[PDB]
Amino acid sequence: EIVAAAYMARISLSATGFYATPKLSWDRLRGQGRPFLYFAYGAAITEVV
Amino acid sequence: SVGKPLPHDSARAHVTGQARYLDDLPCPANTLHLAFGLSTEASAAITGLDLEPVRESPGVIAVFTAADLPHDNDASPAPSPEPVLATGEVHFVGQPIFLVAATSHRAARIAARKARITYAPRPAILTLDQALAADSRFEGGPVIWARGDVETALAGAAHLAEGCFEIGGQEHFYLEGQAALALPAEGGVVIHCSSQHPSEIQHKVAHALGLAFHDVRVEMRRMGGGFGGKESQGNHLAIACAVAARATGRPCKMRYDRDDDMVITGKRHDFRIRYRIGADASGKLLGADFVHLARCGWSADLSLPVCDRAMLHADGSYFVPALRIESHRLRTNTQSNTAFRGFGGPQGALGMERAIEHLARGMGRDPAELRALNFYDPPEKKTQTTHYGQEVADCVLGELVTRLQKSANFTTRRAEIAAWNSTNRTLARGIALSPVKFGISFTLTHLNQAGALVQIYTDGSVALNHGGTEMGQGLHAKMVQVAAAVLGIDPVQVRITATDTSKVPNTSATAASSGADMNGMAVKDACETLRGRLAGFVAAREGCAARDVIFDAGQVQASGKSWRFAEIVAAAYMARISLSATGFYATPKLSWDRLRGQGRPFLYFAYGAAITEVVIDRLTGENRILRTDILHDAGASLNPALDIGQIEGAYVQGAGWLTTEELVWDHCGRLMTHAPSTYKIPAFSDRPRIFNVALWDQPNREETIFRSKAVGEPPFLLGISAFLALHDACAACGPHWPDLQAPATPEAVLAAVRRAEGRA
Amino acid sequence: EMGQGLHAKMVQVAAAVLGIDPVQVRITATDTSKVPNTSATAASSGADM
Amino acid sequence: SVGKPLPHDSARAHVTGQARYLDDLPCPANTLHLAFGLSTEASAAITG
Amino acid sequence: MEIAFLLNGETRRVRIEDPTQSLLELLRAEGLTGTKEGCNEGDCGACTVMIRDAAGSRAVNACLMMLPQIAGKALRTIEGIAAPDGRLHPVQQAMIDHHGSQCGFCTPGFIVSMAAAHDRDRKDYDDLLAGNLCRCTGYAPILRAAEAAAGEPPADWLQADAAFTLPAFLPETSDALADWYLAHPEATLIAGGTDVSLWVTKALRDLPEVAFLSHCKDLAQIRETPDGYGIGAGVTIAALRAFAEGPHPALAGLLRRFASEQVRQVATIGGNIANGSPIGDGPPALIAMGASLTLRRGQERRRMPLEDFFLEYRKQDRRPGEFVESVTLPKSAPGLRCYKLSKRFDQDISAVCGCLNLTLKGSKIETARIAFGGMAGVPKRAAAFEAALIGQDFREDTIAAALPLLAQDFTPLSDMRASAAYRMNAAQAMALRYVRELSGEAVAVLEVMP
Amino acid sequence: MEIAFLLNGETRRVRIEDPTQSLLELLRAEGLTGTKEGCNEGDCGACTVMIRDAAGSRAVNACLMMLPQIAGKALRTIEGIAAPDGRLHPVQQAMIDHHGSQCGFCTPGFIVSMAAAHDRDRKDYDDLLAGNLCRCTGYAPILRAAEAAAGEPPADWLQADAAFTLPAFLPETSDALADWYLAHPEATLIAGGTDVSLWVTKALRDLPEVAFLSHCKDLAQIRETPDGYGIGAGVTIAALRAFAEGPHPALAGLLRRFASEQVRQVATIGGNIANGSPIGDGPPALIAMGASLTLRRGQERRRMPLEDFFLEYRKQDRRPGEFVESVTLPKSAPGLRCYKLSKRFDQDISAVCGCLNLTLKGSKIETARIAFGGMAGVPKRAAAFEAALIGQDFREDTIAAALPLLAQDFTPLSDMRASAAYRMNAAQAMALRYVRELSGEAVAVLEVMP
Ligand SMILES: Cc1cc2nc3c(=O)[nH]c(=O)nc-3n(C[C@H](O)[C@H](O)[C@H](O)COP(=O)(O)OP(=O)(O)OC[C@H]3O[C@@H](n4cnc5c(N)ncnc54)[C@H](O)[C@@H]3O)c2cc1C
Ligand SMILES: Cc1cc2nc3c(=O)[nH]c(=O)nc-3n(C[C@H](O)[C@H](O)[C@H](O)COP(=O)(O)OP(=O)(O)OC[C@H]3O[C@@H](n4cnc5c(N)ncnc54)[C@H](O)[C@@H]3O)c2cc1C
Ligand SMILES: Nc1nc2c(c(=O)[nH]1)N[C@H]1C(S)=C(S)[C@@H](COP(=O)(O)O)O[C@H]1N2
Ligand SMILES: Nc1nc2c(c(=O)[nH]1)N[C@H]1C(S)=C(S)[C@@H](COP(=O)(O)O)O[C@H]1N2
Ligand SMILES: O=c1nc2[nH][nH]cc-2c(=O)[nH]1
Ligand SMILES: O=c1nc2[nH][nH]cc-2c(=O)[nH]1
Ligand code: FES
Ligand code: FES
Ligand code: FES
Ligand code: FES
Ligand SMILES: [Ca+2]
Numbered sequence A: 001e002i003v004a005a006a007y008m009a010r011i012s013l014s015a016t017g018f019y020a021t022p023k024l025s026w027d028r029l030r031g032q033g034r035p036f037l038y039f040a041y042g043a044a045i046t047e048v049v
Numbered sequence B: 001s002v003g004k005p006l007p008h009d010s011a012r013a014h015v016t017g018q019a020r021y022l023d024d025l026p027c028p029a030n031t032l033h034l035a036f037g038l039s040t041e042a043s044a045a046i047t048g049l050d051l052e053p054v055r056e057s058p059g060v061i062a063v064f065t066a067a068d069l070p071h072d073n074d075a076s077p078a079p080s081p082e083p084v085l086a087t088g089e090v091h092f093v094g095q096p097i098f099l100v101a102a103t104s105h106r107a108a109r110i111a112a113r114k115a116r117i118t119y120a121p122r123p124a125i126l127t128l129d130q131a132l133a134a135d136s137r138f139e140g141g142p143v144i145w146a147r148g149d150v151e152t153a154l155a156g157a158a159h160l161a162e163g164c165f166e167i168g169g170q171e172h173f174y175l176e177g178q179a180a181l182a183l184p185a186e187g188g189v190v191i192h193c194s195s196q197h198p199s200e201i202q203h204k205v206a207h208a209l210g211l212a213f214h215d216v217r218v219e220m221r222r223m224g225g226g227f228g229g230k231e232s233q234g235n236h237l238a239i240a241c242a243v244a245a246r247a248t249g250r251p252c253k254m255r256y257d258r259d260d261d262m263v264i265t266g267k268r269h270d271f272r273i274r275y276r277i278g279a280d281a282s283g284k285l286l287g288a289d290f291v292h293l294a295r296c297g298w299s300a301d302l303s304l305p306v307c308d309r310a311m312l313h314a315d316g317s318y319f320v321p322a323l324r325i326e327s328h329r330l331r332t333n334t335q336s337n338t339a340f341r342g343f344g345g346p347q348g349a350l351g352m353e354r355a356i357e358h359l360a361r362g363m364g365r366d367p368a369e370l371r372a373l374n375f376y377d378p379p380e381k382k383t384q385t386t387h388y389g390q391e392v393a394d395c396v397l398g399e400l401v402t403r404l405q406k407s408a409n410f411t412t413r414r415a416e417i418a419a420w421n422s423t424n425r426t427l428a429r430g431i432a433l434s435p436v437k438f439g440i441s442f443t444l445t446h447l448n449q450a451g452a453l454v455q456i457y458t459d460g461s462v463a464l465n466h467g468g469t470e471m472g473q474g475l476h477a478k479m480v481q482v483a484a485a486v487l488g489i490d491p492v493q494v495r496i497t498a499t500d501t502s503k504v505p506n507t508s509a510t511a512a513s514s515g516a517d518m519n520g521m522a523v524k525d526a527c528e529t530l531r532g533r534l535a536g537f538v539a540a541r542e543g544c545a546a547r548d549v550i551f552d553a554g555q556v557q558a559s560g561k562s563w564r565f566a567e568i569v570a571a572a573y574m575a576r577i578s579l580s581a582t583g584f585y586a587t588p589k590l591s592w593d594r595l596r597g598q599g600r601p602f603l604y605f606a607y608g609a610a611i612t613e614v615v616i617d618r619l620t621g622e623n624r625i626l627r628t629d630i631l632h633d634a635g636a637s638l639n640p641a642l643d644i645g646q647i648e649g650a651y652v653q654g655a656g657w658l659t660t661e662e663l664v665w666d667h668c669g670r671l672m673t674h675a676p677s678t679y680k681i682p683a684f685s686d687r688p689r690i691f692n693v694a695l696w697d698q699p700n701r702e703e704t705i706f707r708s709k710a711v712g713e714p715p716f717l718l719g720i721s722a723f724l725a726l727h728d729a730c731a732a733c734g735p736h737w738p739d740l741q742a743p744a745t746p747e748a749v750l751a752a753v754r755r756a757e758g759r760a
Numbered sequence C: 001e002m003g004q005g006l007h008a009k010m011v012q013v014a015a016a017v018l019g020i021d022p023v024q025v026r027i028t029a030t031d032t033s034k035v036p037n038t039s040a041t042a043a044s045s046g047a048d049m
Numbered sequence D: 001s002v003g004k005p006l007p008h009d010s011a012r013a014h015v016t017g018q019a020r021y022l023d024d025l026p027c028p029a030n031t032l033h034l035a036f037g038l039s040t041e042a043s044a045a046i047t048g
Numbered sequence E, F: 001m002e003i004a005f006l007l008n009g010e011t012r013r014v015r016i017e018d019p020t021q022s023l024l025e026l027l028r029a030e031g032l033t034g035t036k037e038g039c040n041e042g043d044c045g046a047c048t049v050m051i052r053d054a055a056g057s058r059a060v061n062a063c064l065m066m067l068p069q070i071a072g073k074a075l076r077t078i079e080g081i082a083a084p085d086g087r088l089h090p091v092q093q094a095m096i097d098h099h100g101s102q103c104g105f106c107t108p109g110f111i112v113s114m115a116a117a118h119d120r121d122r123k124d125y126d127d128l129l130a131g132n133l134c135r136c137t138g139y140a141p142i143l144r145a146a147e148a149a150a151g152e153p154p155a156d157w158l159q160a161d162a163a164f165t166l167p168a169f170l171p172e173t174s175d176a177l178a179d180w181y182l183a184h185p186e187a188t189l190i191a192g193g194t195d196v197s198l199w200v201t202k203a204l205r206d207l208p209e210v211a212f213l214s215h216c217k218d219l220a221q222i223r224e225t226p227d228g229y230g231i232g233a234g235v236t237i238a239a240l241r242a243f244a245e246g247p248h249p250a251l252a253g254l255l256r257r258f259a260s261e262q263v264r265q266v267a268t269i270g271g272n273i274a275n276g277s278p279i280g281d282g283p284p285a286l287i288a289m290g291a292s293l294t295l296r297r298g299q300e301r302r303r304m305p306l307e308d309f310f311l312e313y314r315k316q317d318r319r320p321g322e323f324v325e326s327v328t329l330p331k332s333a334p335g336l337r338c339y340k341l342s343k344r345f346d347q348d349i350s351a352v353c354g355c356l357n358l359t360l361k362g363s364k365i366e367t368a369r370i371a372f373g374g375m376a377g378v379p380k381r382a383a384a385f386e387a388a389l390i391g392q393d394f395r396e397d398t399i400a401a402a403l404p405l406l407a408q409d410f411t412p413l414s415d416m417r418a419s420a421a422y423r424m425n426a427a428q429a430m431a432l433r434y435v436r437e438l439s440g441e442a443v444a445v446l447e448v449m450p
Helices: A002-008 B011-016 B105-112 B128-134 B150-155 B198-209 B235-248 B258-264 B303-312 B345-362 B367-374 B397-408 B410-422 B475-487 B515-541 B565-574 B640-657 B714-731 B746-757 C006-018 D011-015 E023-029 E090-098 E107-119 E125-129 E140-150 E156-163 E174-183 E197-201 E237-244 E249-256 E269-275 E282-288 E383-387 E396-409 E420-438 F023-029 F090-097 F107-119 F125-129 F140-150 F156-163 F174-183 F197-201 F237-244 F249-255 F269-274 F282-289 F383-387 F396-400 F404-409 F420-438
Strands: A025-027 A032-034 B032-038 B044-050 B060-064 B096-102 B116-121 B143-147 B159-167 B179-185 B188-193 B216-220 B252-255 B271-279 B285-297 B323-331 B427-439 B449-456 B462-466 B494-496 B550-552 B555-558 B561-564 B580-586 B591-593 B598-600 B605-617 B623-633 B690-696 E002-007 E010-015 E048-053 E056-061 E074-076 E188-190 E210-212 E222-225 E228-232 E292-296 E310-312 E323-329 E336-341 E352-361 E364-373 F002-007 F010-015 F048-053 F056-061 F074-076 F188-190 F210-212 F222-225 F228-232 F292-296 F310-312 F323-329 F337-341 F352-360 F365-373
Touching: B011 E090, B011 E107, B032 B105, B032 B235, B032 B258, B044 B096, B060 B105, B060 B235, B096 B105, B096 B235, B128 B285, B128 B323, B143 B303, B150 B271, B150 B285, B159 B345, B179 B235, B188 B198, B188 B235, B198 B216, B198 B235, B235 B252, B271 B345, B285 B303, B285 B345, B303 B323, B303 B345, B345 B367, B345 B427, B345 B714, B367 B397, B367 B427, B397 B410, B397 B427, B397 B605, B397 B623, B397 B690, B410 B427, B410 B605, B427 B714, B449 B475, B449 B515, B462 B475, B462 B515, B475 B494, B475 B515, B515 B550, B515 B555, B515 B565, B515 B580, B555 B565, B561 B565, B605 B640, B605 B714, B605 B746, B623 B640, B623 B714, B640 B690, B640 B714, B640 E140, B714 B746, B746 E420, D011 F090, D011 F107, E048 E107, E056 E107, E074 E156, E090 E107, E090 E140, E107 E125, E107 E140, E107 E156, E125 E140, E174 E210, E174 E323, E237 E249, E237 E269, E249 E282, E249 E336, E269 E282, E269 E323, E282 E336, E282 E352, E282 E364, E336 E420, E352 E420, E364 E383, E383 E396, E396 E420, F048 F107, F048 F156, F056 F107, F074 F156, F090 F107, F090 F140, F107 F125, F107 F140, F107 F156, F125 F140, F174 F210, F174 F323, F222 F237, F237 F249, F237 F269, F249 F282, F249 F337, F269 F282, F269 F323, F282 F323, F282 F337, F282 F352, F282 F365, F337 F420, F352 F420, F365 F383, F383 F404, F396 F420, F404 F420
Parallel strands: B032 B252, B188 B216, B285 B323, B462 B494, B623 B690, E002 E074, E188 E210, F002 F074, F188 F210
Antiparallel strands: A025 A032, B032 B096, B044 B116, B060 B096, B143 B323, B159 B271, B179 B188, B179 B252, B271 B285, B427 B605, B449 B462, B449 B580, B550 B555, B555 B561, B591 B598, B605 B623, E002 E010, E048 E056, E048 E074, E222 E228, E228 E323, E292 E323, E336 E352, E352 E364, F002 F010, F048 F056, F048 F074, F222 F228, F228 F323, F292 F323, F337 F352, F352 F365
16 A cells, blocks of 8 residues: 555656675785675584595 | 657668567467457347357367456456456447467467357447437546536627537557567566557556566567557457466467457547537637537546546637536447547547637638637736636747748638639638647646666666657657767667566556656656766766766766766776666646646647648549648657657648548447458548648747657647638538538538538 | 575565565566676675675 | 575475476577587697 | 479479468568568558569569469568668668658558669659558658659669569469369459458458469450450459550549559459459449450350449359450540549549440430449449430530439448448539530549649 | 377377487477486486386486387376476475475476385485485485475375376387397397487487387296296396395395486396496396396397306397397305495496305305406406415405405506506405405495494
């Protein structure tokens, strides 16, 4: 009911969206910078024969 | 770019036959084809329906009936239903009763004719009077609007004219026929059709299949002509196609053979118009009282808005202190009428037009001054209003007609004609001038919105997409042009894409000559956002202010440096600046009340004028247009070529409507004229031998896309001039009122001649 | 989508932010005429972004 | 909704063979089909 | 059965298994999607394609023409109007530069008609395009295109087709025909096929036992005779028009408005006659100028006056196995004049067709041949009027005074085309025309220049 | 030639013009696009479909199966696993509930396998599924789904198929066979066709003169004999496996890793043998257990001990028109032990397959049959090693000391699967394993539980 009402009020129901990760800067040749936003972690213990 | 006379966006493609329309699209080998089997009665209960011969016909695969419909069964563009397949009873000859999917168009057609159907007939209503008699109507009673008090006005009037006359319908005859295709696509469907209204096709198919809207996607890239014929009757095809598809598991396409198309779809509302008009001694109108009987057909379709527009145009081009309209929308057992270029407008206008002419003959006055004397006042205390109460603040009619009369050598010609007539006894030429004032915007207000979505790729090229549909009227080019103008690049970089409810949603039908006015804004709106992003980026980069970044001719300039648009985009890309945007627009200032007949239902009016000259043959009524001259106002045209073209074509169509175009039904309701061999649109040689068309070039007062003005319907009303002239010729043949009815076929003309001649 | 669940997660975010049940949101095919200039889906960054 | 353990978006369709992948899409009868012919040499000049 | 023809420059051989298929359908089913279908009934032109052979090249409607008919001809559709290297034909650029299109759908049609016109340097546009309806543009911009492109060298690539070729029965000789028809009286003879195809496309009929006559050179001849001209049944209405331009302008003037050039190019006088319709436009005129008709059965050969061929609506003096072989026209008939009245001038069916021929003994009416189409189940002379006319003086008033007779000669129908009152009134009106015309008065609306 | 089968419940009759085409293709060209193609080579399972006839129901690879093979059978593909009213099969819901699909592509195949297992209440999933590879999920979720569905009553709608049926040659009896082959010695016999289809799919080869053996009930029997068991050539590896589970657990054990259940259900022992590969897994074991093989030509019948059937790589003791009819196994052989060694345990080709059978005179070695696949152009016993082994005591050190004799018995090759030195060393290792095993020590990695 809200949506229909907006349509009749003539409100656009369409939109695009965009995003760019922040904080990144680093230099390949020198090997220096922040090339990553954050780090994923974990651990695993395997047993075999 | 806006402003230059560039060609249609698919010119070359049209001209080498690569442009594809619906039936040209490639489709899987298993695609089925469909055809409706139609009722042969105007009004009856269906009593038996044996389809066995159908299933048994070659190549047939599924057969359908209202009962097989899995959900809704309703294609109407309005709150009251219209079944797609007959539910127990039929209401006009043509009404589809069941549906056949076989492995080929012919096949389906052939099968559609083998049903064994029994009907229990009922008295049928086929004529306005019958309707009237039986109170067979829509909207529980007529609609009445009144400004001032007419009967008073007319009782005390120095001059007067009462008259009644018929205005016949008109079949669109779009060269590409109704058509559609549906492809099951995991869970949902995708419909391709030839429609002016994909967002509705979506809605109706969705409901037909029980699916939320998001599971249905209508794509429509081009129609071969629509003229309103496709504002709604695209629904039945799409529904059947989607429904057959859901059942058989496979793609199903449907296209009407011409004969079916003319029998099933609607046409322009034929009208009976009854008028009394009156004036002053100096000629100023005192009041005009009008009754409109309109033939709507067996279901509502768009009768409601249509008849509202004709009322809304019953003032024609003149200011009238008092004016009344009583509008009946009569229901009858025949094709459900619908939109057609003009959407009521012509009917209402021709109404006032016929009268004012009758008035003029009445007082031995020259029609032209009579009109010219009553046009609304030019612009620039208390501005006049229309009878619905909307200020008319932009009527340039006085100026324009003047200009036209001069440029057309009006006066002199008029004399040359009188002379010529007096020397002839078998032929008479006649000439007339008629004006046009048309309001712009849907009268159903919330339809006036549009959306666009625009993308700029890293190589700088662009893909434009908007809600409109191209039916031959140049919409896409205008939208390309606006886009290239706002982003500052050459049109060549802008590509148009097909209309697709999955790209711009919730669109209105492309109609009411509102295609360009609104989409134009929307695109401009997107392009403005995009340009905005580019300037912001350039500015920060080159330290300085966005508003001094300049985009023109494919080049961007800032702080003395300059670069190619591409180079800017790539860089914004590298900089991570979104290059995509939507855009949307809603026409401002509108408000009005249908029941009261008061408000501002329109943003601005479109005008123009036309002077046509014709000759008729006093013995048989044969006749034809020798010359026409038009001067029409398209605002600051977005594309003069494109506009001249709509003007020329509309004129022809308009005239076509009042001359050889004639619909005929038989005593049992059957459409007798259902094929080009018997319904006759203007053929090449009916083109006027001298056809001068030119534009009034003046900005629009109101804030529209580059101060242009809608130009798709208005010009259609210039056709009246032809009828008017046809009637001038009759008038020249005797001293009585010719009382020429429309359409003016030769039989019709010959009848007018005799009246005026007094030979019966 | 290549099996990793991206479209569900995207439907989920959408339904959450809009305040409605996920059933009301349907995903469409990736299409460059609809969202442009994209990076490949990779770097385990499909959903983050 | 974020946070709940919901199934993949196309799980019903995976599981009944309705999800179409590229070779499952229907296409016009006249569609052509391709294949590369390959080098049989680790490194060479093509002479003929 | 196998036939061959050139298709847009390429040689093509085809296995006909259904001889009744229209050219329009082969085409789209081959994916030559460029030729549109707009009515499938002959009137719109949207299916126009260009054929060629020894007689030259013409544009005709693909929707009326069935396969067997194009054997050994060269065919060119819209997709092959442009040159192999991609260059547009002068006619396309023209249409582009002049905005000759809006919706697009009627275009391939015009281009093909325009091209074929261009190929033969014909410039009578109004008549050449009569058969291409466009609902979008008003036509004006199309005339500019045609004009603009006429100042341009013909397309070479299109003339190269000239060099070419150098189930259902296809006689090559009138003899072969007569033999076979004789054995298969019940067969369906197809000439131009412009009336027969609507039986398959609209009435959804199916015809077995079929023979095509457009391959009998000897049935389609124009022979000068001691006492008139011998016209073969297979002669095309366009052709008949061309020939008449000389000795029978009136007849020529009539045919101008007999369908469109696209139908005239293949429609046959035999056919127009054999069809037997009271609205045929051939018969009235021919009867007015009192031509004769020749039937044929095996080697036998009757020969009546035309009007006598028509007994009742839908029924003719034709014997089992008997077929129309020619008609004969006098060397001259200055008295002829023909009137065609319809809702619209070009490409339209007659409400009434008036054909008048009067001989004079100076001021006195010697002979009166008066025929009408569309006022009865059959075309027929108007005896009582004719009669009452002999011997009287040739002035308006005499005629004025005989009119009523017409209402006894005929008692016309009413229908979508026109009401009986009007058809009647109009028949009468034609005769006033005839006097006024012969007396040199201005009478015809189509001759008025702006 | 026309055959008939039930397709997802519906009866279907097909005209075979190419008998070599695969079920996977008919299937797709019919548009039953749910059966995927992922290797076309038998290894992936992605094309798995379910067939059923009177022996019961089984899941098999449609990419290996040609059409004439399903005649009279009942075919169920993924698109027919759910009931007609739309209900999903217990297995489907399970898959949805437990996230057993990510990319989706290997799913219809797992469903088909899973369903077919459910049909027969089979629960050995690691084996049932070895032949369905999935690259996305780790298998774990699928075992959960399998497990959760087993607690659910079988689908009634799939069982109803049991009611069914109640150019290229198709023999119904060994006689008809022997006759026909005799006249067409050069014909291509196809049994299971799990080796022959790769000639058509990968070598792109084309076979004319073809006969299918899977319809000779009499060629696929297991008969109890006075002195052993007589196994028909058409008996499937699955079938053989099942029979041996009792009297020949070691052979059974081996067959558990012979291809996958999907292949095992149609691959035949006859074929394994007739293919003649030195890596076939059958022969070494049978040789070790000392089985004999019967050939047959017309009515004639030879009969050597199996090892003798293999002469040279790619070359067998087979006469024109002679075919393999059965093999015969002793009633028992407790000493057999079979080792398969590959890169991966399941569905893999052997780098070396070693089979050993020793008989004992208390602590003393009476007989020693020792055979190997993969270490030579042909499966062969290890004579020098066998010989040096008799009379000695069965302890690890005597075996240790005879090892080098294997280097004389075989000179293994090198290839992608393994280097020569490894193949060799492995052979030797197998011997040591055999003592260790029989001597009661723990030695197989596949029997250690976490
Ligand atoms: C678009 C359109 C516009 C038209 N305009 C006109 C018009 O204005 N005026 C008019 O009169 N007609 C008009 N027609 C119809 C007209 O009669 C035919 O198009 C034409 O004259 C018949 O020529 P045809 O060879 O095609 O006849 P066909 O279609 O070949 O059919 C002739 C009929 O007569 C039979 N027939 C043909 N040849 C012989 C033979 N020689 N001997 C015995 N029987 C034979 C055929 O069996 C068939 O029964 C129009 C039709 C269409 C398609
Ligand atoms: C995915 C996959 C995995 C495999 N894994 C293994 C593996 O684990 N170990 C292994 O040993 N093999 C394996 N194989 C193949 C093994 O030979 C076959 O898979 C099977 O044993 C051959 O059986 P068949 O009935 O299909 O023979 P077919 O393919 O039908 O043909 C075998 C050859 O024998 C001929 N032939 C068949 N029957 C007779 C008859 N009785 N008399 C004479 N000639 C006949 C045929 O002409 C053909 O030449 C694998 C194959 C595949 C596809
Ligand atoms: N060539 C062509 N022009 C046309 C039509 C058409 O179908 N073909 N439809 C008309 C109708 S009904 C309207 S309402 C306007 C639409 O123009 P617009 O999109 O810019 O509003 O097109 C008019 N011009
Ligand atoms: N089931 C499945 N999971 C997968 C893959 C795949 O093809 N299928 N691609 C891997 C790779 S390379 C990436 S880079 C991530 C993508 O995660 P994301 O898209 O959400 O960034 O898929 C990982 N997980
Ligand atoms: O007001 C309208 N004017 C229209 N013109 N063409 C279609 C129209 C419509 O729905 N409404
Ligand atoms: O850094 C990257 N990591 C990736 N993973 N998968 C694709 C990747 C890429 O382009 N870049
Ligand atoms: S389709 Fe209209 S003339 Fe052929
Ligand atoms: S452009 Fe539309 S009919 Fe010609
Ligand atoms: S497709 Fe891989 S096993 Fe058949
Ligand atoms: S789900 Fe992707 S391969 Fe198994
Ligand atoms: Ca219509």
